[PDB]
Amino acid sequence: EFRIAQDVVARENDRRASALKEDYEALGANLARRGVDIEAVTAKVEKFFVAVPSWGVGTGGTRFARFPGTGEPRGIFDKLDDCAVIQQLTRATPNVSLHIPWDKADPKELKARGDALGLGFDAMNSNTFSDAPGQAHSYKYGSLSHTNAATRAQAVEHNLECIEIGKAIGSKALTVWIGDGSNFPGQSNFTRAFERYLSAMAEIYKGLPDDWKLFSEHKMYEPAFYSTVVQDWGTNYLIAQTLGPKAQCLVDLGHHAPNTNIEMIVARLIQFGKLGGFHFNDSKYGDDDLDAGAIEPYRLFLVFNELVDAEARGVKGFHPAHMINQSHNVTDPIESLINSANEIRRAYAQALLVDRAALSGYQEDNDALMATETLKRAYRTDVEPILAEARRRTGGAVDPVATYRASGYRARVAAERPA
Amino acid sequence: EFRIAQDVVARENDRRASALKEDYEALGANLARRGVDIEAVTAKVEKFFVAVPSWGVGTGGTRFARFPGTGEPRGIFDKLDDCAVIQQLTRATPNVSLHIPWDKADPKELKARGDALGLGFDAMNSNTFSDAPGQAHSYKYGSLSHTNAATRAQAVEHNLECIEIGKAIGSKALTVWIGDGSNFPGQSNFTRAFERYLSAMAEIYKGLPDDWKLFSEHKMYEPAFYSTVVQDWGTNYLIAQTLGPKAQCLVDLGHHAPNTNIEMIVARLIQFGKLGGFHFNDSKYGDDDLDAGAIEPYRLFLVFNELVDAEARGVKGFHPAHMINQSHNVTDPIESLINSANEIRRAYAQALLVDRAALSGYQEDNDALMATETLKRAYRTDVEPILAEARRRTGGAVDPVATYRASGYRARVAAERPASVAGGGGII
Amino acid sequence: FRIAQDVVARENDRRASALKEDYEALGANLARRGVDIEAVTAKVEKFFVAVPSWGVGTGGTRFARFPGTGEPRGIFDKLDDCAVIQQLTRATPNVSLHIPWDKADPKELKARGDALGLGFDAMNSNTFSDAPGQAHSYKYGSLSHTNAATRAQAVEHNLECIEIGKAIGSKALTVWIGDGSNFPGQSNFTRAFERYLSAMAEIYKGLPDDWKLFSEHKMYEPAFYSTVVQDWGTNYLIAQTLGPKAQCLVDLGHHAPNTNIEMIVARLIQFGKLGGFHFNDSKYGDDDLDAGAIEPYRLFLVFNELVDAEARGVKGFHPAHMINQSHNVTDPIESLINSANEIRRAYAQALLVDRAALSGYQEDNDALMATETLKRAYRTDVEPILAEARRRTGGAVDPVATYRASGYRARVAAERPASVA
Amino acid sequence: FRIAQDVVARENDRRASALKEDYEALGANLARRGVDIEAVTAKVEKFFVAVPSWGVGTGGTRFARFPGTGEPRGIFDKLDDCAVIQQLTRATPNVSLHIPWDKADPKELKARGDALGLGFDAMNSNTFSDAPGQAHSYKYGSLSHTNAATRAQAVEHNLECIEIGKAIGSKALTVWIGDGSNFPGQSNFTRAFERYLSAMAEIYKGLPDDWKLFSEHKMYEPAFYSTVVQDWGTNYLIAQTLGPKAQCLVDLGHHAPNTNIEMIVARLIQFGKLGGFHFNDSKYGDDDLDAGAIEPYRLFLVFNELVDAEARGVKGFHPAHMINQSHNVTDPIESLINSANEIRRAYAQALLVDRAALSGYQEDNDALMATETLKRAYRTDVEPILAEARRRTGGAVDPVATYRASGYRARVAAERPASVA
């Protein structure tokens, strides 16, 4: 089925078709002069997918307040319905990331709804950073690394349950992010807490299917404000290496210390085969969870530059999971996810334009200026025509947000859902 | 009234009296050899007070979750009862800061309960960073600087109501902290938003009694994640200078960019007569709101060093409002506030030990090493005996938290108040 | 001509066809967006940024300096090199001098400038290092030093900078000092600032009627605990205290991690104290890297504030624009060329912003479309506009390629002896 | 003896009475706390930290260097000054050399060391700067340079450092390089690291059976975009890859803002790769300030992790301790004296932590009492312990006071020619 009327999509596409043809043909000619086939780029772009977070479909908030908009989803099924719009218009978000227990519901019904909407499911996300109804042990002082054996056991069991749910809907990975840490010096013994965490994760790994991957995710701080067990990529590497071949590291762009060179972390994990996936978003201060590329678009391009270089270097078996992990506090969640998915494809497309042979030459000759200008020649290229054409050719909209607004979807769900 | 039984306080004090006498006498002898009269220090420490936040006695949380403890206060009345315990045991927190509309209630009752508990009221706190039930205009996109005139008017009226409540309870100041800002480049026109904020604040200023002060509080980020209207002390100064004599700047320790020299900001505000007050807490990453001094005790000392320097140079018209502004997510709120107030008095006491004459001499001759060592000689001094003796002589506890736990207060209120439930924090 | 005209023409012709195709395509796209590319190119052709005399030589860190070939031996060699940057980019007609590094007969400096087609921007004083024969050391400070005689010496140095500037055509003095402390207690924050204010008041008295005095803040380095002029708040206090001729200079790399710099720019403009800019890029500290090489969007956002000021009708707004960088691992001339290009790039994109649309989205709190409105401008590849601007004004379509084709570096390497001691 | 024995004795007797009072008072307080002050003093007396030979000379920034009087020039003058620090603090018996700065006949160095009562700690190689006559420049890197001959030259230099070390009593080589990039694209992150690992493997082969190889990470400077060995994660990969003799060196000021450094220390210890420390303090970047002058609690928290290990004697836990600072505005000897003091101070306080009580509060999740347990130790003024340890071992009760009373600085100023009177 189609959440957005096909006639609206056709209408809004035809309205912008002439201009797109002009821009696409112009870009094609420019690229041809640069020895690049625009068709080959568009072909790869229409194959690039990034998962949308079920929890980012509703309006997000801070510890100070939540300001919901109209037609907020009542649950996971409404969320899937809204995710269907993002995929229909961008054609870059075929899979949805579920969060348990936030999205707990009959797995069979979830799969049924997903299939009907043309949506698949990406990595499952466990939640032991908050307490659920009737929970025997609280995670106030931790979960997988809690000092209490029974609490760690309960946390392990929760993760295994997430795996069961995922196996029923077609998910092939479990992402584990916990808030475990301390707010005061001395509250936790750094090493003992990490030892407890490794032991618990070993139990989860033992219950991990052999066609699944286990992603551990580091974060410098929040909710813990003094120390965090899985605080950075170094600790994360130790975890993945210790657990096994199926265990890898997930890199969330907003989880690093100020000024960190994140693209280098990406390169390092790839070199040692532990880059499991990404959580895309942008930020300026902390884990701001803003729309991808809205603050620092070049950094996003530089991360993708390392991914494309890995392919160019001949790295094998490298298929990192791509997921958006954002909070939309002051915009229509659907529009933000739409443009964020767009921005990720934008950075990817520009990375594909880098003249790898030229760059390699400038790197070997230590021609720093031309090496950086080689990256800029790709990054400065406005690939919007490629992104728009890719969408058009695949059933999407030339201008996703414009078509979304022309459809009146928000007003529609606002009337179908409570205030 | 005595939230904590006097027999328990006396008992727990006598149990530690012998050791305290020994430590106090030893420190007194050491200070004497250093030309300092311990009695003079203790006398000033007993008179140093810092306000406790009414909302601080309840367990706090993050956007990810909240894990309330037992006996959580139901409202302002329960909160005042808990604050009374902090004051009784530390004798450093006689005043409480209210937040509206969280603590809205009959002013007469608030004053009556405060007087009965031996508590006064510090600066009022307005709230236009969240929406209340039945509110006509949302603050989602701002309040005092919102693009919608009616929304700014509503925010102004709210602040004026806070002043009215404050006058009725004995308060003499209004602290204004808003989340106003943007999460995306272009969303807000920096200049126009600030102009709107200034115009609205001018209206609030007009409602200030002759003996009141208006404190604007800067914050680098959160809830706004790209830009914030009142983002730093520079913008804050422009605000205070523009509004008038009654307008000053409030400095919250955890509201600055990484590595910022906060003690210099304090000095600058004092120099230009705009240091309105402080919001004490500690942090390591962002506006962590941790227990004061639990992370960087020396920084707290350095801030107080600037305060004592001004307090010693007879800086006239210098009465900065001191307040604790913390969130207690993994401890008993009352215990943390107790030790936080203690740490603040600790930093103050150590600042009092600094040999100002010696320091000035080393500054003039550019003797950096001895200048810094002069501060360290004061900071390295364990003033706990002075803090404990000050509490003992004023009706407090030698060891506040030990006495608190010995009284069984938490278990008591846990049995009198309804149970709470853990839940999310606001992310979804 | 530092670079042979036949080389510039040859390299321009080689790229003319492609430039025509790209410029005409961009023109059509902009026309569809309601923008006149000719109007934008006409404005870009007139955007100038000053080149630092000290940036034409290779820079270094406290750990090492690795000079290249043909390093300029003095200010005259430096001006000759700056002439190359102006000839090829046509965006750097003025040079910033630093005293005493560039001390020389003002008449000779002026004569060399005129001969090369170069002017002089704001003068820069230096009381963050000791020169020979100095009666007092600046080890513990200069304008804010505890010793009155030392402050007096620093004041006289700044006045000498003004005298030199008056003779060569300069109209402003930029004052950046390292004054601060490395240890808590070493300095009395307030007294040090008062000392600074008194000294600057004396320097202000020496300013001609049409001159400006720019004070520059910096969070740290060389002082690692406190710095007298540490941020824009202190800087504003200085400017407001000194008078109408005193304004603040904003150096992009002098702010705390994560600082919203573009907002500082907006605040200073609102209160009429934005004197000028020191452009460069950075990732960690005051890295002094080529402008826009690290965070091109931030550079655009700063220019967005500058263009908005013009749109709001701010009167008498003529901020000074200067590049302040250190080239440690590249040919200084090439980096300055591309840095000047990046600055014009950000400026050009700022001009493309549909502010009519932006104002509507801001009023309606449509954050998504507001940010997308800025992005539609920023995502636009304005290189064809920059290249055409150069073609029309005697510059090179591809400045660095032309510079390399000219063999200029090898030429000066053969003419200039490398320092041995 | 660099410092006259009569001066040391005189300045000790002058402060003996007060010390007796303070030491006894602290001893009584600790006894009421179940702690034997003597056990602490005995351990403090044996805690040593190496002094950098280059640390006794005045340091500077990229903007300027302001030398003091009697600047030591050459390793011999430097060792003479280092001897003063050891004589007065008794906490710095070993000196760390830096090659080629300290190049000299090994037999002569060893002889001078023995004569002054000084030993030698880890050797430090230098491939972050170019020495005269050098065949290949390190401008674009050293061990990870793209040019094979340059990497070979860097490897040979490090092997030479090992040979010098073997001749003087050293048992480790610390490798810190500036290798990195200033621009995105300049370096291929992975290939540069591959080259580094291969080059380090060659240096590893030259290590005697009882030697250690310490690689040191640094976020930035001299590289301002990326650094090959940028953090502890990369450092761990290096040490684990090279072998048992390879470990990581943690320099306090080489981390990103807000980093929890004590956790990094704990992680390295758990995996047996904590080779040693480079002590100093900072507020902004790699400020290289006097240890504990800015954040004394952080220093204590680092030592809390060390003592937690020293108490149990963890496998592979025998960290080398070294001071790595730059003294730009103080007498280098005085700063090193007080820095070594602060290091012993933090160690002594960490020794006071009631581990049993702490472990209990950690298991019960009593965060408030757990942190208060650390504070009870940290708030304790251990100066009497540090002073008594010095007095009992031939040092000075008040090191800096004795240093000034001796007139040493004026003495060496009279023996050493400055650049200018």
Ligand SMILES: C[C@@H]1O[C@@](O)(CO)[C@H](O)[C@H]1O
């Ligand atoms: C939504 C949650 O946010 C995190 O990035 C933690 O900040 C994690 O990846 C998800 O579980």
Ligand SMILES: C[C@@H]1O[C@@](O)(CO)[C@H](O)[C@H]1O
């Ligand atoms: C509790 C609130 O927190 C703030 O510090 C803002 O972060 C403000 O001072 C109070 O209103």
Ligand SMILES: C[C@@H]1O[C@@](O)(CO)[C@H](O)[C@H]1O
């Ligand atoms: C080159 C110098 O560098 C500064 O930016 C200070 O860091 C100043 O503007 C100039 O004097």
Ligand SMILES: C[C@@H]1O[C@@](O)(CO)[C@H](O)[C@H]1O
């Ligand atoms: C003195 C040098 O400084 C470093 O810390 C690098 O910043 C290194 O450890 C030493 O070689």
Ligand SMILES: [Mn+2]
């Ligand atoms: Mn994430």
Ligand SMILES: [Mn+2]
């Ligand atoms: Mn996150």
Ligand SMILES: [Mn+2]
């Ligand atoms: Mn506050």
Ligand SMILES: [Mn+2]
């Ligand atoms: Mn706050």
Ligand SMILES: [Mn+2]
């Ligand atoms: Mn500058």
Ligand SMILES: [Mn+2]
């Ligand atoms: Mn600078």
Ligand SMILES: [Mn+2]
């Ligand atoms: Mn080091």
Ligand SMILES: [Mn+2]
């Ligand atoms: Mn260093």
